[PDB]
Symmetry: C3
Subunit: 222 residues, 3 copies
């Protein structure tokens, strides 16, 4: 359509949907409780992602925010996307190590403050305050990843599995605040169509790729 | 008032409130844990429903959406209603059969995508895309009901109880996407005042009736 | 800034942030599960509160509502604040006595109807209906506190601890609907800058003070 980033919203819609289906069919048959939790958690993300990517593609997940002298297109559906799918990722990581509730409660709460303050940053009309919200949202993320290491006697399956998804996690998660800071929402260094592609690349890798790495091990079975 | 559907919003407000009270007084005395969960879940729905029906009655739960050449009155409070009360219904059904977490997580998540995409459909200005959101929301519902049967060794109390509320569930739940598709939100086949009545009839039967069928058995006691 | 209540939004921002930090550092080291839940719950509130107080301070958490012949400044971030932090308080109180799920589900649900209908009251343009929402929100709160006493064999630690925070709870919680009713949102008896101070005084005492009373006892340790 008229928006150059359309192609990347369409490709991400497509990869999120083909990914959930894969996951659905993959999930049919399974009857292991625990396994019935990663499939759930793991399948729902691009499931939710699918709808949120489609809401962007069709234009619903978009709003205009004025700042720095203009009308900046802002896809709030991302935050609705992540606010629902980041704890799924942290729940998959959490259940993985068997985290006590107090820390899981601490992770999703920092999580909604992370997405929550990320979304506040996204829609704040005062340019310099956008970077205050980023800094608090980055400190919460920066907080979560700190727990993601020394925040916690596991089986060598889930654990080695835990190294991967955590390292893929720091790099992936930390890449998100850099793309925000450099794209149209932040300094405006990188064009929205490139930022959209970077986010869809992280989202598909986060949703589908990270998905394709977790459930393909017996780290998930009880 | 000026809106012909007012009478049905007022009657539903009334039946939701008299229903929660019934449930409240009914619930006082009870000290069985499990039983303390159906009363909770079961009472809260028309409790929440009451407030959401009243917000419609008083006009707050209403917004105007342009499409197909006009300003269509849209009661978003329904989705806020269902987004909060449909998992209560699925939690009552779920706890009922004792569903593992992975499937309960899978049901509420499809559930918020169901209400979530239903609400997206409801407020999307592009007429043909409204029917795409309906189709995904119907596929999630269509998904949930599929689990509602072959998605799972129970006592003959909860189980026979489970036949009822599930069958009342498929017919009730499946009636909702038909009323949406045929009313003002969808094809506009049926007037808003008739659609409102159908929804309030399903909502009262869903909230109060379905309520009046569950807790009046020892299928709920531990 | 131009708003006289700014000073109180700035002080509350500050006290909420210094308070979470205190709590964070206090929380580092702890490895007791249960204790890892009060710190979580307890720390997150002024954590969330911090961001919501800052969103008010910077102007984001504010909207204008017309009624009684004018444009009344309304800080919706409070409800987003409380909707997220009141169940944390009730979870701290709940876990404290070890409440069965049915009642905890019943408390947060009345809770979101309390904040939920409080927020509806806050943004309703019809003046007399604002007081209907207050009355339902007060009845839910009035409901929660009723459970807060006779809504439930505990250790003399958590229990005596329970007397305090509950009594501090009724007075604190009940003070909130009085400040609402008397401030700019309600009868307009008390100026917004005084109402803001009263709420920040309750919020800081609720978030930080109530915080500073709970975790400083072994009522929290397992
Ligand atoms: C807990 C634990 C975590 C709490 C974290 C602390 C920080 C929380 C902050 C929150 C505040 C949200 C801000 C937002 C509600 C305010 C919207 O106002 C915008 C401009 O002021 C409206 O612009 C117009 C554009 C609008 C677009 C915004 C809509 C988005 C909504 C996404 C949520 C969805 C929920 C699924 C719905 C079904
Ligand atoms: C950082 C704090 C300690 C934590 C809390 C956040 C408080 C303030 C955040 C950082 C701070 C403002 C950034 C200052 C931005 C400032 C240079 C704006 C430049 O002025 C120009 C016109 O006045 C902006 O118009 C348009 C020109 C623009 C392209 C300017 C872009 C500004 C960019 C901000 C970059 C911030 C990242 C360094 C921080 C990475 C660490
Ligand atoms: C470091 C810590 C907080 C830093 C303190 C700051 C003090 C602000 O001084 C004034 C700048 O002249 C702010 O008022 C100037 C008018 C405006 C007020 C801005 C107030 C905010 C900048 C204060 C909120 C702190 C921010 C959050 C920094 C995020 C951090 C947690 C990553
Ligand atoms: C964005 C990508 C990097 C693009 C570059 C692609 C090639 C580089 C991939 C990065 C990855 C490397 C991490 C290796 C892992 C293996 C380490 O496993 C250890 C075994 O116990 C885990 O302990 C602890 C493990 C530690 C792992 C955390 C590493 C740190 C995260 C690095 C930051 C990232 C980049 C943040 C945004 C960036 C794009 C600007
Ligand atoms: C999880 C698991 C499930 C996630 C499911 C995936 C699909 C999620 C989609 C969500 C997106 C919600 C759309 C909505 C936020 C966007 C609002 O923008 C409208 C037009 O663009 C505003 O019109 C003006 C009218 C506006 C009316 C809309 C308001 C409604 C809000 C209902 C929520 C309430 C929460 C209780 C509040 C206290
Ligand atoms: C169905 C897909 C495979 C799943 C994903 C959804 C993608 C598209 C959804 C179905 C599809 C559009 C419906 C096409 C509607 C089309 C006839 C609109 C008619 O054109 C008129 C003017 O151009 C509409 O104006 C006003 C006149 C109106 C009264 C027209 C009403 C249209 C109605 C749509 C009915 C859809 C239900 C069949 C689908 C039940 C299955
Ligand atoms: C069946 C499955 C998905 C169907 C594929 C469709 C392909 C769309 O082709 C073009 C129509 O000319 C859409 O671009 C035309 C311009 C516009 C783009 C519309 C894109 C969407 C129609 C694609 C999203 C699929 C929808 C979801 C169908 C719901 C289903 C899960 C019940
Ligand atoms: C809207 C109402 C139907 C209006 C008509 C009122 C009279 C008909 C009531 C329908 C009901 C009939 C179902 C009977 C039930 C009893 C079956 O129990 C079985 C015992 O194991 C359960 O297995 C499996 C049981 C199976 C039950 C699922 C049935 C299917 C659901 C039928 C669809 C409904 C209609 C969807 C919307 C409609 C209004 C257009
Ligand atoms: C469950 C259990 C509990 C359910 C309780 C029953 C009562 C629920 C009622 C809810 C309804 C919410 C009303 C609101 C969505 C409607 C907004 O419309 C306003 C005027 O109509 C918009 O004005 C413009 C101003 C707007 C400001 C309102 C925004 C606020 C949003 C706060 C939520 C945040 C979520 C964190 C986001 C990240
Ligand atoms: C109470 C019900 C049984 C429960 C459900 C709620 C339904 C109605 C709520 C109470 C009721 C209206 C309050 C009536 C307000 C009425 C006096 C408004 C006064 O009229 C003036 C112009 O017409 C208001 O303009 C501006 C002048 C204003 C300053 C008037 C302020 C009105 C105040 C309302 C005070 C209500 C508290 C008593 C209730 C405490 C118990
Ligand atoms: C707003 C403050 C009161 C300002 C005044 C400051 C001095 C008065 C502090 C009030 C407090 C007094 C409560 C004492 C407590 C000790 C009782 O403990 C009992 C031991 O089992 C608990 O049983 C049951 C205990 C019972 C406790 C519940 C008391 C009731 C709550 C009183 C209402 C408050 C005021 C509501 C708003 C007001 C500000 C208009
Ligand atoms: C064969 C299997 C395992 C999966 C393929 C199903 C297709 C849809 C989504 C999965 C695609 C690829 C794996 C995810 C990995 C990535 C790091 C995602 C970023 C790349 C984006 C475009 C490149 C191609 C791919 C989408 C296959
Ligand atoms: C006597 C008991 C069990 C309940 C009556 C309390 C009143 C309020 C709500 C309950 C009403 C009726 C039972 C619910 C069943 C229905 C299928 C609802 C649809 C009907 C709507 C109008 C018809 C009358 C009734 C509301 C009694
Ligand atoms: C020394 C410790 C325990 C705490 C101090 C850290 C500072 C920040 C927040 C804590 C402040 C005070 C305790 C909370 C109690 C109150 C009833 C709050 C209302 C008072 C507001 C202003 C008065 C001063 C104080 C904020 C210290
Ligand atoms: C969908 C999956 C992933 C893991 C999404 C993760 C996204 C982030 C981790 C976001 C952090 C953000 C922060 C830290 C800074 C401001 C805005 C963001 C929301 C992009
Ligand atoms: C309040 C109780 C009940 C069971 C509500 C159930 C409602 C639905 C099941 C809705 C499904 C919808 C779908 C399937 C299609 C588009 C829009 C709806 C939200 C009405
Ligand atoms: C942040 C901590 C506390 C305990 C906040 C508690 C707030 C209330 C208890 C609010 C009740 C309200 C009611 C009862 C009446 C209408 C509006 C309010 C939301 C202020």
């Amino acid at each position: 359509t008229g928006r150059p980033e359309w192609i990347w919203l369409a490709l991400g819609t497509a990869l999120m949907g083909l990914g959930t289906l894969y996951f659905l069919v993959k999930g049919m048959g399974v009857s292991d409780p625990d396994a019935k939790k990663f499939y759930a958690i793991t399948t729902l993300a691009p499931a939710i992602a699918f709808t949120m990517y489609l809401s962007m593609l069709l234009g619903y997940g978009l709003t205009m925010v004025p700042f720095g002298g203009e009308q900046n297109p802002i896809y709030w559906a991302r935050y609705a996307d992540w606010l629902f799918t980041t704890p799924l990722l942290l729940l998959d990581l959490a259940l993985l190590v068997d985290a006590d509730q107090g820390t899981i409660l601490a992770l999703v709460g920092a999580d909604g403050i992370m997405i929550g303050t990320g979304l506040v940053g996204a829609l704040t009309k005062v340019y310099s305050y956008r970077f205050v919200w980023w800094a608090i949202s980055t400190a919460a993320m920066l907080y979560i990843l700190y727990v993601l290491f020394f925040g916690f006697s596991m089986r060598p399956e889930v654990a080695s599995t835990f190294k991967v998804l955590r390292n893929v996690t720091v790099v992936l998660w930390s890449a998100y605040p850099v793309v925000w800071l450099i794209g149209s929402e932040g300094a405006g260094i990188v064009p929205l169509n490139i930022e959209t592609l970077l986010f869809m690349v992280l989202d598909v890798s986060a949703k589908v790729g990270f998905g394709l790495i977790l459930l393909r091990s017996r780290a998930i079975f009880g």
